[PDB]
Design a protein around this ligand. Structure first.
Ligand SMILES: NC(=O)c1ccc[n+]([C@@H]2O[C@H](COP(=O)([O-])OP(=O)(O)OC[C@H]3O[C@@H](n4cnc5c(N)ncnc54)[C@H](O)[C@@H]3O)[C@@H](O)[C@H]2O)c1
Ligand SMILES: NC(=O)c1ccc[n+]([C@@H]2O[C@H](COP(=O)([O-])OP(=O)(O)OC[C@H]3O[C@@H](n4cnc5c(N)ncnc54)[C@H](O)[C@@H]3O)[C@@H](O)[C@H]2O)c1
Ligand SMILES: NC(=O)c1ccc[n+]([C@@H]2O[C@H](COP(=O)([O-])OP(=O)(O)OC[C@H]3O[C@@H](n4cnc5c(N)ncnc54)[C@H](O)[C@@H]3O)[C@@H](O)[C@H]2O)c1
Ligand SMILES: NC(=O)c1ccc[n+]([C@@H]2O[C@H](COP(=O)([O-])OP(=O)(O)OC[C@H]3O[C@@H](n4cnc5c(N)ncnc54)[C@H](O)[C@@H]3O)[C@@H](O)[C@H]2O)c1
Lengths: 20, 336, 337, 336, 337, 21
C-alpha cells in the first residue's frame, strides 16, 4: 500500500521497476 | 524516409540503436533520443557497454543537445514527460518506447500528442494494445493501429516454436519456465521493491518472478488461449536467457521428428527468426544471436509419445532489439 | 557402542557432513578420522573457514601433525589417495563416508572394506548395482547385510520425496524434470578441459546444460516410476542452493491447492523433517542450511488442463543432502547387528 | 532510555537494527522506522537478508502500520519529507539518518523541526558538520551538537590504524586504495548515472570511484591534514572491503615492528576496534566482524626503511553499523 | 620458410595466443601443432567457443582424428603430458610456446628441444636463471644463442613499461605495488584443497590476497630497480582484465599532469603500442582485448608531497600478454640463424 | 606437508596450480 502509491506516480524508480 | 525517436535509451534503447546501425538500406532513420540522462550519458553509454563491448563507430557529442554516430547527428533530449517532447518540431514519424513506464494507451499516446504518429512499445502492452511477434502474427499488422507492442523477450523466443509445435502436432496444454538473465528491475543488493522477490540481490540469487509470457503467446496465436501457464526464474547472468517448454500434443511423436520440424521451419517460414543448434553450447555463446529462438536440439525429449520438452536460447537484449527493428521496418513499409 | 566413522574425501560434502553431524545431539556416531589428498593444514583450515557456511562455531585446531581437534574431540587426519592403504582396521572404522566422487563403484568403494572398514556410504549415486536409499522414501528397506550403499544425489533427494506423494495421491503417468542448479566443484572456473564440453565452460559466467541421472534414479527408490521420468540440469552462477522444476501428467484430475495441501499433509506426517512447504516469497539464498530435502514453493504450483502438474522445490544441495547422509548413517547405526 | 527512529530502512538501517538487537542492555530503544516502502517491505527485508541471512528473531506485522520484533512493537511510517514525520508525536529522541540524502544541516535539521533532538548521519556530512570515529575522536563529542556524522565506512577502517601509525612512527605523507564491495549507488547493468563509472554493471566490473575518505581522516585526526589522498575500486563482491594504505613515516621501521604496534593498540586503546589477523583469510571470512579494522599482518610491508604498506579488512555494512550503535550509545550516555 | 610453432598447453594463454597470432597480418610464424592433455574434440570446441573472447571468427573444424582445421590451415593435435614424447622432430617444429605452466626451468622446457624443437618460450616467470624479456623494456637484448626464454608474467608486462618511464623520467627510490587481479585457473571454484590456503577459497565469491613476484621480477628486465619494489596481488571476482596500483617515491618533484604527459610522450614514441594513456572514465570490461601491455588511467594519477606518485594501469591479462608472447616469438623468428 | 610433496610430482593438479601474476 505505501510503496504501491509511491510507484504509480514514480514507476521508473528503483523500488518500482517491474519488467514482464 | 521514416523518422524515429528512441524514448528510454536503456538496454533496449541502446541495443536498438546498434541493431539498426548494423542494418543495410534501413527504411528508418533515427533522428532523436530522449532519456532521463543528458548527452553526456547518451554518448558514453552508447560507446562503452559492459555486455556488448565497444561500439565500432565514431561516437561523440555534436553541440550540447546532440551526438553524432559516424557523422549522423542525433538529437538528445531529456524530458521525463513525453507530452513535452519535440516530436512535431523534429518531424518524428515513429517512437520506440523503451522506458518501460509508458506501456498503456494513455501513456504511450502522450507521444502522439507531442507530434509522433506511431509508437512501438518494447514490452507487453497494458489493456487493448495490439501485440505482434515477428515471424508469427506480424503479417497481420494494420497501419490503422497507432500504438502497438512488440511483446516481451520471452514471448518472442517462445511464440515462434510454439507456432510450429501447435501447427505440426497440436498443443493440448503446456507450461513454461524461463531461466532468465537478471534485468534492470531487480535490485543489486536487498532493497525495497513492490515485488519482494525482485527486492533481492540479483547477482546472488535464483529469484522466481512473475511472467505473463505464457498468456501473451495467446495474443499472437489465439489457438493457444487458455492452454499455457508459466513461471520465470531470474539467475545471476547479465544477459542471455533460456526457455523450457513442456507441452502435451495431439500427434504422437519422437524427439527427432520434433527437432526436424524446427529445422524445416528454420529454412522456410521462420528463416532468420528460428535456429536449431546441434552443438553443446552454454549461455554466453548465444550472445548477439539474431534469432528469436535457438533450439538446443540435444535437450529435446518426448516422454510417453505425447509429452514434449523443448529448450530454447535467446539473447534477451540483442535478439529482442533486432525484432523491434524488424517490426519498425514492417510498420514503415505498411505506412499509409 | 557409538559407531566409529571415517570421512573419505573432506570436500564440500565431507565438510558439510562433519558440521551437520556436529550439530546433532546424542549421535549414535563418532567421527574419528578424515582422509584427503590434502593433510592437516588443509583439513583444519577449510573446516573452520567456509565461503558458503561461514566460520565454524567450535574450537578447531591441529593436534600433532596428523590430527585435528574439534571442541577437544581428536580426529585423525590421514592422506592417502589409495583407499586400500588406509588404516581402517587399526582405527576400528565401522563406516566410511565415501565423499571423494571417485570411488563410486563397488571396486573402488570396496577398497575401504579391504582396508578394514565394515560399511561404505557413498555420497553420490552408485555406478552399477549398489543399493540406493533416499531417507523418507525407501531407507526403511535398508538391510544391514549390505556393505556398500548409496545415498543418491542431492537432486534425487529433493525430487523423490514429492514424486512419492504425487504418485501415491494423484498417480503419475509420465513426467519431465529440470533442475536449476548451483555450480559445483566438478565445473571449471574458467574455460578449460573437461570430458563434458559444457562443464568445461566458466561456471560463474554461464547457464550450463548438463545431464542428471536423477530422473531414472528416482525409479531406483520408487520402482513404479520406472520409465516414466526424464530430465536435465541447468547449472547457474550461484555457489549453493538448487531448485527442481517437475512437470507430470497425473491420473487424478486436480488443481494447484489440492496438490499443495497434499504436500502439507505429508510434511505433517510421513515426511516430517524431510518435506516442507514454503508460503512466503523467498529466493535461493533463504534456503541455505535448510534441513529439508524438499521445500515446495507453494505459490509456484500450477495445474494446466486439470492433469498437467507443475511443481517447484528448493534444496540446499550441500547441507540438506549432508543432513541426509547423517540420517542414513544413523539408520545404519540403528540397524547394526 | 532513549527513543530512536531509523530514517532509511536500507543496508545500514537494517544492519543497524540487527546490530542493536544483538546488544545487551542497550540505553537505546528502537520505536520507529521510516522508509519510502511500507510495513510489507520492512518486515520481509528485515527477516530475510541475502548478505546477513535470516534474522533469528520473531519478525511479523503488527497492524497496518507496525511490526513486532521479539514482542517489541515498532512503528513503520512512510514519508520522503522528514518535516512531516511524527517524531514529536512518538517521543523520538534520536534519528538514525540512513537515507543517504539528508547529510547537510538544512536537510538533517528537518528531523528536529519534526520533533527529534538529535540526528546521527550514517555518511559523511556536508558543511562543517561534527564528525566522529569511535576509538579515534568520539571522546570529543559534545551534547551541545544536534547534528553529527559517523563518517564513511572506509574512514572508520582507515582512521584507527592511521592513528597508531602516526603516533608510533609519524606519518609524513601517504596514499590509499580501498578495494570495495559494490554498493547500492552502483547500477546492476549499464544505465544512466551522473557518475559514468557507477553507471556500469556492478557485478561485472572493477570500477574506480572517488572517495573523500583520505581527506576526511584529517577531521578526526587533524594532524593528518593535507597529508593523505586516495581512490576506491568497487569490485563484484556484495559485502566486505579492504583498505590498502601506503605511508612514508619519519621513524625507520620494519614489517614485524609495525604489526606488533597494531597488536598492542588492539589490546589497549583500540580494543574492540582494531584487530590483527595472522591467518591467511579471504574477504568472506570478515563478514560480521565487529572491528572497524582488521590488519592483515602477512601483507604488511616496509620498503626502503620508511615506506609502509598496510592492508586492512572491514565489513562495510555490519562493522560500520556497529560503530553507528556505539556512537549513539555515546550520545545517550552524555544526554543532558 | 616460416618458423614452425607448436603450442604446448592449449589453455587460456595457449588459446589466446592462437587467436592473437591468427589476427596478425605480418607474421614470421606458422602454427602447425598443439599439445594438450584433452584431445582434438576439446581443442576444436574450446577454440571456437570462448566465454571470455566470444566466438572465434573463423572456420574451426576437426580434420581427421588427429587434427583440426582453422580457415583451411591444418593444425595437428597431440596429447602427451611428457614433452620428451612429443613429435616435434617429426613435425619440424622450430619453436614451442610453453603454456602448460609446469615446464618453467631448463630441464623441463629442455625436454622440448630433446623432442626436436629448437626454441622454447615460456608464458610465465622462469624458474632459476632463465633469460626473461618484456617487449618494450629489454626484449631488444635477446640473443639467438638462448634456447629457453621467459616472457615473465602478465603483471610484470603491465608494470615494467610504466616503471621504465617513471625511473628514466623522475627517478625511483623505492616503491610498492598492489595488483587487483581477475581470478585465474589456479584458484578453486568452491572451497577445496590447495597448497595455498587462499587460492583454496571460492574464486568468484572472494577478494583473495595472493603471493606475487611481479614486483621483484621487474628487476630482471630493469636492473636499476633491484631491491627497490615490493607488492601484493588481490584476486577479485572478475574473469579477466586486471589493474596495477603503483606507489613510488621519486627523486624529481612533480605533479599528476607532469607524470601523465610523460606517460603520454612515451606512448607516442618509445612505447608506441605497448603503453597507452586513457582519459575517459572507463571500467575493467572496457579494456578487454586491449593490445597494450599497459593503459594508464590518467584521471587516477596522484602525487602526494611532491614526490609520492600513485599510478593506476589497466591490462587484459589473458589477451594483451598473449600479444606480447606473439611479439617475443616474432623477435625470436627475426633473429633466427 | 602431504600436499606440498604431492604437488612436486603433480604441478598441474587442482590442488597444486600456483600462477604467479
Ligand atoms: N532487458 C531486456 O531483456 C528486455 C527485453 C525486452 C523488453 N524489455 C522491456 O523494455 C523496457 C526497458 O527495459 P530495459 O532493460 O531497457 O530498461 P533500462 O532500465 O535499462 O532502460 C529504461 C530507460 O528509460 C529511462 N527512463 C525511465 N523513465 C523515463 C522517462 N519517464 N522518460 C524518459 N526516459 C525514462 C531510464 O533512465 C533508462 O535509460 C521494459 O519495459 C522491459 O521490460 C526488456
Ligand atoms: N556438491 C554437491 O552439491 C553434491 C551434493 C551431493 C553429493 N555430491 C557428490 O559428492 C561427491 C563429492 O562432491 P563435492 O562437492 O564434495 O566435491 P569436492 O571436489 O569438494 O570434494 C572431493 C574431495 O575428495 C578429495 N579426493 C579426490 N580424490 C581423492 C582420493 N583419491 N583420495 C582421497 N581424497 C580424494 C578431494 O581432495 C576433495 O577434498 C561427488 O560424488 C558428488 O557428486 C555433491
Ligand atoms: N552500505 C555501505 O557499505 C555503507 C557503509 C557506511 C555508510 N553508508 C552510507 O549509508 C547511506 C545509506 O546507504 P545504504 O547502503 O544503506 O543505502 P540503501 O540504498 O540500501 O538505503 C537507503 C534507504 O533509504 C531510503 N530512502 C531514500 N530516500 C529517502 C527518503 N526521502 N526518506 C526515507 N527513506 C529514503 C531508500 O528507500 C532506502 O531504503 C549512504 O549515504 C551510504 O553512504 C553505506
Ligand atoms: N591467464 C593469465 O592471465 C596468464 C597471464 C600470464 C601468464 N600466464 C601463465 O601461463 C600459464 C598457464 O596459464 P593459463 O591461464 O593458460 O592456465 P590454463 O590452466 O588455462 O592452461 C594450462 C593448460 O596446460 C595443460 N597442461 C597442464 N599440464 C600439461 C602437460 N603435462 N602437458 C600438456 N598440457 C598440460 C592443461 O590441460 C591446460 O590446458 C601459467 O603459468 C600462468 O601463469 C597466465
Amino acid at each position: 500500500d505505501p510503496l504501491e502509491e509511491y510507484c504509480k506516480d514514480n514507476p521508473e524508480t528503483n523500488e518500482c521497476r517491474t519488467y514482464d | 524516409k521514416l523518422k524515429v525517436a528512441i524514448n528510454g535509451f536503456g538496454r533496449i534503447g541502446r541495443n536498438f540503436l546498434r541493431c539498426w546501425h548494423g542494418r543495410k538500406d534501413s527504411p528508418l532513420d533515427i533522428i532523436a533520443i530522449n532519456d532521463t540522462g543528458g548527452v553526456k550519458q547518451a554518448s558514453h553509454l552508447l560507446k562503452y557497454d559492459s555486455t556488448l563491448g565497444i561500439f565500432d563507430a565514431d561516437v561523440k557529442p555534436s553541440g550540447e543537445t546532440a551526438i553524432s554516430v559516424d557523422g549522423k547527428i542525433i538529437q538528445v533530449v531529456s524530458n521525463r514527460n513525453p507530452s513535452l517532447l519535440p516530436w512535431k518540431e523534429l518531424g518524428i514519424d515513429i517512437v520506440i518506447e523503451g522506458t518501460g513506464v509508458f506501456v498503456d494507451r494513455e501513456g504511450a499516446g502522450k507521444h502522439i500528442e507531442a507530434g509522433a504518429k506511431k509508437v512501438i512499445i518494447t514490452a507487453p502492452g497494458k489493456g487493448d494494445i495490439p501485440t505482434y511477434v515477428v515471424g508469427v502474427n506480424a503479417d497481420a499488422y494494420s497501419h490503422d493501429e497507432p500504438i502497438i507492442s512488440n511483446a516481451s523477450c520471452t514471448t518472442n523466443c517462445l511464440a515462434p516454436f510454439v507456432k510450429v509445435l501447435d501447427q505440426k502436432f497440436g498443443i493440448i496444454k503446456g507450461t513454461m519456465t524461463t531461466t532468465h538473465s537478471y534485468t534492470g528491475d531487480q535490485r543489486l543488493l536487498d532493497a525495497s521493491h513492490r515485488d519482494l522477490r525482485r527486492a533481492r540481490a540479483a547477482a546472488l540469487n535464483i529469484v522466481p518472478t512473475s511472467t505473463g509470457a505464457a498468456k501473451a503467446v495467446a495474443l499472437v496465436l489465439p489457438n493457444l488461449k487458455g492452454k499455457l501457464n508459466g513461471i520465470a526464474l531470474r539467475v545471476p547472468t547479465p544477459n542471455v536467457s533460456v526457455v523450457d517448454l513442456v507441452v502435451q500434443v495431439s500427434k504422437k511423436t519422437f524427439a527427432e521428428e520434433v527437432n526436424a520440424a524446427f529445422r524445416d521451419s528454420a529454412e522456410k517460414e521462420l528463416k532468420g527468426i528460428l535456429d536449431v543448434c546441434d552443438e553443446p553450447l552454454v549461455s554466453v555463446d548465444f550472445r548477439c544471436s539474431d534469432f528469436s529462438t535457438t533450439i538446443d536440439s540435444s535437450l529435446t525429449m518426448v516422454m510417453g509419445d505425447d509429452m514434449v520438452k523443448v529448450i530454447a536460447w535467446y539473447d534477451n537484449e540483442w535478439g529482442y532489439s533486432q525484432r523491434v527493428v524488424d517490426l519498425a521496418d514492417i510498420v514503415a513499409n505498411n505506412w499509409k
